[PDB]
Amino acid sequence: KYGENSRYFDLQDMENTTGSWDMYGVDEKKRYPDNQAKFFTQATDIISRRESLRALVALSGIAAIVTYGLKGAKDADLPITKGPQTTGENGKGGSVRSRL
Amino acid sequence: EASNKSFPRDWVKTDPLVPVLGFAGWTIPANIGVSAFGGQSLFGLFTQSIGENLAHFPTGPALDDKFWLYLITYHLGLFLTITLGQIGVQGRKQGYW
Amino acid sequence: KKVKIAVDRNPVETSFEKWAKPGHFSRTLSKGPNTTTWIWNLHADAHDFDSHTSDLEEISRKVFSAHFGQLGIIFIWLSGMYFHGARFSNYEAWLSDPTHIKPSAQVVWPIVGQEILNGDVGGGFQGIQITSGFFQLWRASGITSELQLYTTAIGGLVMAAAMFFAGWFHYHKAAPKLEWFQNVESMLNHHLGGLLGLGSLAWAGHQIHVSLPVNKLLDAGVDPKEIPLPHDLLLNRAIMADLYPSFAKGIAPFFTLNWSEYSDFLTFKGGLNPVTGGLWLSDTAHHHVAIAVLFLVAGHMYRTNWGIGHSMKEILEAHRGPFTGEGHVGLYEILTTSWHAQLAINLALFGSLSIIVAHHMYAMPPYPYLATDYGTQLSLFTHHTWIGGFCIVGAGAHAAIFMVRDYDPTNNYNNLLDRVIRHRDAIISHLNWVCIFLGFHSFGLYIHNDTMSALGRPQDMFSDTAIQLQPVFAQWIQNTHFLAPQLTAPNALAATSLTWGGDLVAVGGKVAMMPISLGTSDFMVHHIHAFTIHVTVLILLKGVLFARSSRLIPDKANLGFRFPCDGPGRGGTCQVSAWDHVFLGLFWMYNSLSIVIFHFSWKMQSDVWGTVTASGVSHITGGNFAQSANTINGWLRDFLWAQSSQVIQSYGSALSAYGLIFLGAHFVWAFSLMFLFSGRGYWQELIESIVWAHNKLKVAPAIQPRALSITQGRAVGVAHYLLGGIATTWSFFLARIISVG
Amino acid sequence: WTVPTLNPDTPSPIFGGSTGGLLRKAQTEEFYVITWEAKKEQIFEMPTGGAAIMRQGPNLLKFGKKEQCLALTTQLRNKFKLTPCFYRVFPDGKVQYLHPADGVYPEKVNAGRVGANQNMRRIGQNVNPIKVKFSGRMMSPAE
Amino acid sequence: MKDFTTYLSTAPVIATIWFTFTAGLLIEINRYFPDPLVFSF
Amino acid sequence: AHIVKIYDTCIGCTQCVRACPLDVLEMVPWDGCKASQMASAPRTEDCVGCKRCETACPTDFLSVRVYLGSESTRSMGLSY
Amino acid sequence: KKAQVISPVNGDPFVGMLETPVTSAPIVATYLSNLPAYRTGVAPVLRGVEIGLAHGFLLAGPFIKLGPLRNVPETAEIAGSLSAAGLVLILALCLSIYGSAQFQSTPSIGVKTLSGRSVARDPLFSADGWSEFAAGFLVGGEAGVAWAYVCTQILPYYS
Numbered sequence A: 001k002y003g004e005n006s007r008y009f010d011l012q013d014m015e016n017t018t019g020s021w022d023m024y025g026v027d028e029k030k031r032y033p034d035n036q037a038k039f040f041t042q043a044t045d046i047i048s049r050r051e052s053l054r055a056l057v058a059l060s061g062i063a064a065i066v067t068y069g070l071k072g073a074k075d076a077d078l079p080i081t082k083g084p085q086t087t088g089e090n091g092k093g094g095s096v097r098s099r100l
Numbered sequence B: 001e002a003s004n005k006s007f008p009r010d011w012v013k014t015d016p017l018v019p020v021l022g023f024a025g026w027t028i029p030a031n032i033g034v035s036a037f038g039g040q041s042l043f044g045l046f047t048q049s050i051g052e053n054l055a056h057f058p059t060g061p062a063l064d065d066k067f068w069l070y071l072i073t074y075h076l077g078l079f080l081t082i083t084l085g086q087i088g089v090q091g092r093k094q095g096y097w
Numbered sequence C: 001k002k003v004k005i006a007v008d009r010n011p012v013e014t015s016f017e018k019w020a021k022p023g024h025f026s027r028t029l030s031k032g033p034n035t036t037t038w039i040w041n042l043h044a045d046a047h048d049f050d051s052h053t054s055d056l057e058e059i060s061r062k063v064f065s066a067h068f069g070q071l072g073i074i075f076i077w078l079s080g081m082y083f084h085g086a087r088f089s090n091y092e093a094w095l096s097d098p099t100h101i102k103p104s105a106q107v108v109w110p111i112v113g114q115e116i117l118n119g120d121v122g123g124g125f126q127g128i129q130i131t132s133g134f135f136q137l138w139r140a141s142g143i144t145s146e147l148q149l150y151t152t153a154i155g156g157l158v159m160a161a162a163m164f165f166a167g168w169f170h171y172h173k174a175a176p177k178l179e180w181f182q183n184v185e186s187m188l189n190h191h192l193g194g195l196l197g198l199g200s201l202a203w204a205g206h207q208i209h210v211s212l213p214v215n216k217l218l219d220a221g222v223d224p225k226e227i228p229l230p231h232d233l234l235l236n237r238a239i240m241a242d243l244y245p246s247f248a249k250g251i252a253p254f255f256t257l258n259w260s261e262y263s264d265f266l267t268f269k270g271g272l273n274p275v276t277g278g279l280w281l282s283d284t285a286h287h288h289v290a291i292a293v294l295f296l297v298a299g300h301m302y303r304t305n306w307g308i309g310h311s312m313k314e315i316l317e318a319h320r321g322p323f324t325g326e327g328h329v330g331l332y333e334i335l336t337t338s339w340h341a342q343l344a345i346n347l348a349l350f351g352s353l354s355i356i357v358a359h360h361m362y363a364m365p366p367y368p369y370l371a372t373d374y375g376t377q378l379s380l381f382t383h384h385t386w387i388g389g390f391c392i393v394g395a396g397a398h399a400a401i402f403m404v405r406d407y408d409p410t411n412n413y414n415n416l417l418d419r420v421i422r423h424r425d426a427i428i429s430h431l432n433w434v435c436i437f438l439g440f441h442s443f444g445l446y447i448h449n450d451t452m453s454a455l456g457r458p459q460d461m462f463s464d465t466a467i468q469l470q471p472v473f474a475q476w477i478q479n480t481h482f483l484a485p486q487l488t489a490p491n492a493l494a495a496t497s498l499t500w501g502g503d504l505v506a507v508g509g510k511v512a513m514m515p516i517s518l519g520t521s522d523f524m525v526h527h528i529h530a531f532t533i534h535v536t537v538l539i540l541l542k543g544v545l546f547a548r549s550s551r552l553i554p555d556k557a558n559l560g561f562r563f564p565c566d567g568p569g570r571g572g573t574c575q576v577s578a579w580d581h582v583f584l585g586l587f588w589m590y591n592s593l594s595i596v597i598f599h600f601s602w603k604m605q606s607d608v609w610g611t612v613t614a615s616g617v618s619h620i621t622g623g624n625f626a627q628s629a630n631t632i633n634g635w636l637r638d639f640l641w642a643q644s645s646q647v648i649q650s651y652g653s654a655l656s657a658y659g660l661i662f663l664g665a666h667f668v669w670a671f672s673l674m675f676l677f678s679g680r681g682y683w684q685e686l687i688e689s690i691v692w693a694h695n696k697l698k699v700a701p702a703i704q705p706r707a708l709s710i711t712q713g714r715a716v717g718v719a720h721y722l723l724g725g726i727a728t729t730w731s732f733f734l735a736r737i738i739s740v741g
Numbered sequence D: 001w002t003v004p005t006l007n008p009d010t011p012s013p014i015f016g017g018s019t020g021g022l023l024r025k026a027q028t029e030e031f032y033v034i035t036w037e038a039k040k041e042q043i044f045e046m047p048t049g050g051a052a053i054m055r056q057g058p059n060l061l062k063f064g065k066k067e068q069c070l071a072l073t074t075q076l077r078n079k080f081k082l083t084p085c086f087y088r089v090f091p092d093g094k095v096q097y098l099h100p101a102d103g104v105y106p107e108k109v110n111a112g113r114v115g116a117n118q119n120m121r122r123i124g125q126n127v128n129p130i131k132v133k134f135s136g137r138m139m140s141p142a143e
Numbered sequence E: 001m002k003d004f005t006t007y008l009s010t011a012p013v014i015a016t017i018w019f020t021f022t023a024g025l026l027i028e029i030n031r032y033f034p035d036p037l038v039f040s041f
Numbered sequence F: 001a002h003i004v005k006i007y008d009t010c011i012g013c014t015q016c017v018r019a020c021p022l023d024v025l026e027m028v029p030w031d032g033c034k035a036s037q038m039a040s041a042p043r044t045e046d047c048v049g050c051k052r053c054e055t056a057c058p059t060d061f062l063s064v065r066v067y068l069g070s071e072s073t074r075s076m077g078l079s080y
Numbered sequence G: 001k002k003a004q005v006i007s008p009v010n011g012d013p014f015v016g017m018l019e020t021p022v023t024s025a026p027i028v029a030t031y032l033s034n035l036p037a038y039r040t041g042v043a044p045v046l047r048g049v050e051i052g053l054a055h056g057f058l059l060a061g062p063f064i065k066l067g068p069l070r071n072v073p074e075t076a077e078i079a080g081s082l083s084a085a086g087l088v089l090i091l092a093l094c095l096s097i098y099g100s101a102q103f104q105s106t107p108s109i110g111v112k113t114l115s116g117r118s119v120a121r122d123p124l125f126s127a128d129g130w131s132e133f134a135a136g137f138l139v140g141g142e143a144g145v146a147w148a149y150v151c152t153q154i155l156p157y158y159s
């Protein structure tokens, strides 16, 4: 067969030959509480598809970034929202010619 | 390697005498008074450093504490003793000489 | 008996017959040239002795005599430096005033206006201010006269002629057999007892009898003309017993083991001499006595002809683990069979040693008035750092050459080398990941600081003020070595260096050495150092482990060590060879050590070097390294643009040649890019369109003009790149530090 | 001569394990198997890395690339003077014989193998690329 | 010494000799006629 | 797959086949330029494009000619 | 000189993984097998929820203690939690497009488990399985970021 006498190639066992192994994967079904599994299977039902999750991402992200520009960058008190709060570098156009 | 077809689970040959004897062979000699310590010992000063640093428990030791020196030397010798003890035990048990 | 002299009488006849026939050493080039590539191959294969023949005996003889020639050349160079310090120097003037007079030992002839290079160095002299530190070395030897330099030069020329006679002898007249070279036990026993043990013992004797009294009197203000000559300190014991009363006891305290009586000239002072700014010569004398004893007992370790001792084969063969298979078996055969395996290890450790030297010569300046010659100190760090990096790259090279040529898989079955080649993918993958991790977390820190300070957010930088990454481990080690004489080295009067902390030693107003603080900038640059080192290691080690085979090319060993590519196939296989990995490791060695020496220069000019005139240490750049070197714009502005003011304004002054070699080095570096960016096939067609014009005018040569090889193009490019970059840095460094330091 | 069937009962050389072996290409696309009958136990050089000990008699060895198999083929043919023959194995179990596709090695004639991809003109008698323009795909004048 | 003089006839030795001679000639010209910018004499 | 074409200047020296690391080329008898052998490229699906073959061809320029074409796993030397 | 530790993977010296203590020590293999990534029998949505909770709770810390608003007292945790929410959303989009890209071929080769018993293929490595895995990842990541904010709000020794 495969595992004995150093016969490392068998046509009837191509998984052991090629190396298609699960080094750490176990197939046990008893992990999570069924109340918790029900909760988190139901909480993801509306997004368990590709296009629907991409729709949620698009909606939530467009909304988050738009409201970031509208209120969030102000609530974060970003300097770009406050403005210069001074005259600025207006009159110092150059060391020689102090342009506006 | 015609042998070793399963990666044995006892890859380290554990004899519980080894850690005990390494702790004993390093720490008991680590409690011998030398005049460089002022009549005290490395391990005694180490336990004293841990006692002083346990007083202000949340904050950690300083940089000029002299606790780190004792810790690092004690653990250097300790890890070397335990390592060589495991090596010697599994060299006497196995071949290698 | 086993270990003995074994030579052949008159193996090779001494004649110029093979001088008239170039390419004689190979079977391919001895037929003569037809293309110009022959002219390059004649030089590339000149010292490739292991391809001229297969027998290790003839290769070994060639190597031995070649080493003799290198030694003779080194002796010529040493004698030349001593001679230039004897005839063309201000040494006797510098000894009287070493804090004011600039060390110079190269006079320029006044031919085309280069008499401007004969600068006003001091002592009524006009020449080029040297930075090799020979004056400090000679003062530390106790020279005090140009005649002694003259006779040392003549002795060096005698010894050079002796070395060349020795090479001729040991090749042509009496050349040793292979079983003589293969006595590595004897070679190590002798190179440890007699070469490094007896050499250090003899140098200790000189340091006891010549350097210590002469320098003790030099430090006591005595004029070098009225100091007793060394032979007078040998014969007249009264002078020495006046200087050190333990010389009144003779050599009895040694044979009675009352060694503490010798505590006048064998000390453990530590720190620096306050009057010279260098290490105590009594400390160095005791040092060399000690390591001489140590090496002389280390040279009695291996077994040669009397059963006592060790067999290196037995140490190696009995060192094996459960993780490592058979262990070091077959390595004795590897290293007693391959010259390249030896050369790899030797170059690696020799270059790491040269960098050890660079780091240990500035923190512990061994020579009087070395630390206060900031040019000599900077040059001596930079030079040995560069030599070390080059040697390390060559170590990777010759490891690869071993793996290609001298590797035999029959000798190496499940030994350590086989087990490395078997999991080279793990090795190189983890090395790649750490190189990426370090590149990010070491350079993106600099980019983060650039972005923050450019955006006007200095509170978000990685600095000693905003987000501190303090190097707490190195700081703890500094404090552990500063407090060492109090607890962990009670017989030391001071620490080894003042860089650990404490008081500064300032000599002549200039700071010889002072504590070195480390902060966030030092953290970042040290991690940059480790990053670049790890990438160079990645390249060279990947060239070593994949020198025989890879998942791309499984037959790379048959292709060779030095080949350009297998083809454009497999998507493209250029620079798959183990030679091209060295070619790239050269670039990364340059990139690493440029930053190393930049870190050195800036840290020294900002936080160590300076003057104390009033109450206060005024450094050269004012300590900007702490706050300015968080950014790449910092190294631009305050190092590469600020410290370039001395090299680009050097025109019309004594340092103008430094500016010239600045510009010319910028030329050569960029010229390298003609060879690195391009490829042979363009130049061959350009060359043949030129050969058409030569044929038309009947001036086409018989030796057909070819473009350089691909490998040769890469070699020329890396050579010009390294030369130009290193010489640009050399000019910049020296022009800066001769002026401001 | 007839096409040999791959024997899976053939043992493998004594190898202690490497990291240069098979990847997911073996499980997904293809891999290769080289066989040879040895007269003795000789430590040869694996193209993946490291040295293995061939067994006295028949050997068998897996590789993820045909170039690996032919590298070992030339190594066993030139340094050991053997006559190996390798295949191409697909993950579904299909075996395809590859190297001595007619029985004899390709540098030797076999008196009956057909000449393929032979242009019966000189290399300078190829047409200009303007004549093979707009032939569908981008096509060399050698066609 | 026919072979020795053949060696001195090689390309690099002849180039060294010839360029040493040329450079020395130009150097001695520039010593005895310092700073020759134009053809005035 | 790359395109390997072999022209009638082949003198049949077998060097292109001995150099080929992928067993793409073979020597066919007399059904080519002349008698006394000839080369051929029947297994170009395995050609990577290394041009060892035309590196070893001794004729004027190269009787064997590799024209780099579309790439694949077999034509990119991938073990993955 | 016996008792060699390093072995080839599953005894096969030609596959190239070299079973090693870091790879296949009992405790290490036990820990890696117990991770929700390698629970090939449980639904991928729940393993995604668990993985996402972990990753959304850990990656709030950096944005909190090192973000641009790290120094304003109360705005820091809010800002870092919103940043971690955005990053979790980005990662969920990444997972969705990865499920679109990868799972189209259904490779026919089987899977064993280093002991011979031919286990089934993980339903996670299917288009629907990865869709529900990314759904669980989004839900669990946003919940974990929210709870990281909560733990900054309620934990006693939160400095």
Ligand code: CLA
Pocket: C112, C113, E026, E029, E030, E034, E035, E036, E037, E038
């Ligand atoms: C390619 C551009 C270029 C040009 C046009 C020049 C031109 C000149 N340079 Mg500049 N120079 C250049 C590049 C150039 N240089 C470079 C790249 C460098 C850096 C290395 C320099 C560095 C440099 C310096 C440092 C100096 C010059 C000098 C000179 C002058 C030399 C005049 C001389 O030697 O009289 C020679 C006059 C002759 C008549 C000799 C002609 C040659 C032969 C011998 C004539 C044949 C006669 C006879 C038949 C021979 C007998 C045969 C024999 C075998 C017996 C001249 C203005 C010098 C100067 O003062 O400049 C103003 C000077 O000091 N140059």
Ligand code: CLA
Pocket: C012, C013, C014, C015, C016, C018, C019, C025, C061, C062, C063, C065, C066, C068, C069, C070, C073, C164, C165, C166, C167, C168, C171, C172
């Ligand atoms: C004058 C005396 C003499 C003579 C006639 C010979 C004759 C011979 N030797 Mg021997 N040899 C001699 C001295 C001599 N040797 C010495 C002193 C050494 C010790 C270094 C050797 C070491 C030696 C070895 C190891 C080998 C020979 C070989 C040979 C043969 C050819 C060498 C050749 O091609 O020379 C022409 C070569 C040169 C002129 C090169 C000289 C290189 C010198 C030493 C260093 C110069 C470096 C220079 C400073 C760099 C400047 C850089 C520049 C850019 C400015 C021939 C039988 C070879 C042999 O037998 O192979 C069959 C061989 O392998 N010789």
Ligand code: CLA
Pocket: C063, C064, C067, C068, C071, C180, C181, C183, C184, C186, C187, C190, C191, C193, C194, C195
């Ligand atoms: C006490 C004995 C002794 C000493 C001092 C040395 C010293 C040396 N050996 Mg070693 N060697 C020895 C024993 C010794 N060897 C034995 C027993 C063997 C046989 C196994 C070898 C085999 C050996 C090889 C194979 C090679 C050396 C090399 C070297 C030189 C390395 C260059 C260096 O470090 O620069 C330091 C330079 C000096 C200290 C300069 C002074 C050199 C003095 C004059 C010679 C040393 C004494 C000499 C060995 C005894 C013979 C004297 C002579 C008059 C007969 C160095 C001079 C290498 C070398 O450079 O080749 C030339 C080299 O390739 N040796």
Ligand code: CLA
Pocket: C201, C202, C203, C204, C205, C206, C208, C209, C233, C234, C235, C236, C237, C240, C246, C247, C248, C249, C250, C251, C254, C262, C289
């Ligand atoms: C290799 C290292 C070295 C050397 C060469 C010397 C050499 C010397 N030391 Mg120093 N010394 C050294 C290391 C060295 N020392 C170290 C490391 C220490 C620290 C422990 C000292 C500490 C020290 C002290 C404290 C003193 C010396 C003294 C001396 C001198 C007396 C030698 C003596 O009595 O020994 C005896 C040696 C011999 C008997 C050997 C003599 C061999 C002769 C030359 C044989 C040759 C004859 C020949 C075969 C035939 C003749 C040829 C021809 C005329 C026909 C001598 C100059 C003393 C001195 O004079 O102070 C200045 C002294 O007081 N030394």
Ligand code: CLA
Pocket: C043, C044, C045, C046, C047, C048, C049, C343, C347, C390, C391, C392, C393, C394, C395, C397, C398, C401, C561, C562, C579, C582, C583, C719, C723
């Ligand atoms: C102890 C030191 C040492 C020794 C003995 C050797 C010995 C050898 N090396 Mg190794 N090597 C070393 C250090 C050393 N190397 C270092 C430091 C590096 C990194 C640069 C390398 C990198 C290296 C590579 C990459 C290769 C070798 C090769 C070789 C072999 C032939 C070298 C040859 O023929 O060149 C003859 C000499 C030359 C061609 C001259 C080189 C010209 C230099 C670059 C000019 C620039 C130098 C100059 C100082 C700058 C000023 C220029 C000025 C003139 C204008 C030989 C066994 C080759 C080999 O074995 O492959 C088969 C090979 O491919 N070496």
Ligand code: CLA
Pocket: C431, C432, C433, C435, C436, C437, C438, C439, C440, C443, C444, C447, C535, C538, C539, C584, C585, C587, C588
């Ligand atoms: C400035 C020029 C430059 C740069 C940036 C790099 C960068 C790199 N080289 Mg290359 N290299 C260069 C010049 C350069 N090289 C030259 C001139 C040579 C000589 C031939 C080489 C030769 C060479 C070799 C031989 C090797 C490398 C390797 C590496 C990598 C190691 C560092 C790393 O991964 O850190 C992480 C990346 C960086 C530090 C690059 C800067 C990125 C910063 C941090 C910002 C990131 C931006 C961020 C993602 C935002 C994106 C914005 C969005 C709009 C896209 C990296 C990709 C090694 C490698 O690939 O193995 C690890 C390797 O083996 N290089």
Ligand SMILES: CC1=C(C/C=C(\C)CCC[C@H](C)CCC[C@H](C)CCCC(C)C)C(=O)c2ccccc2C1=O
Pocket: C674, C675, C676, C678, C679, C680, C683, C684, C706, C707, C708, C709, C710, C712, C713, C714, E015
């Ligand atoms: C410029 C260049 C060339 C062309 C360089 C030519 C071929 C040679 C350069 C000069 C040679 C050395 C001629 C110099 C003169 C001769 C030494 C003969 C002396 C004659 C008198 C000048 C004394 C390449 O062949 C090449 C190949 C691969 C990668 C990059 C490049 C590349 O960048």
Ligand code: SF4
Pocket: C569, F004, F019, F020, F021, F022, F023, F024, F025, F046, F047, F048, F049, F050, F051, F052, F053, F054, F066
């Ligand atoms: S390119 Fe390489 S693989 Fe293709 S036919 Fe030519 S030699 Fe063979």
Ligand code: SF4
Pocket: F006, F009, F010, F011, F012, F013, F014, F015, F016, F017, F038, F039, F053, F056, F057, F058, F059, F062, F063, F064
């Ligand atoms: S190498 Fe060239 S000439 Fe020789 S057989 Fe091949 S194609 Fe023909």
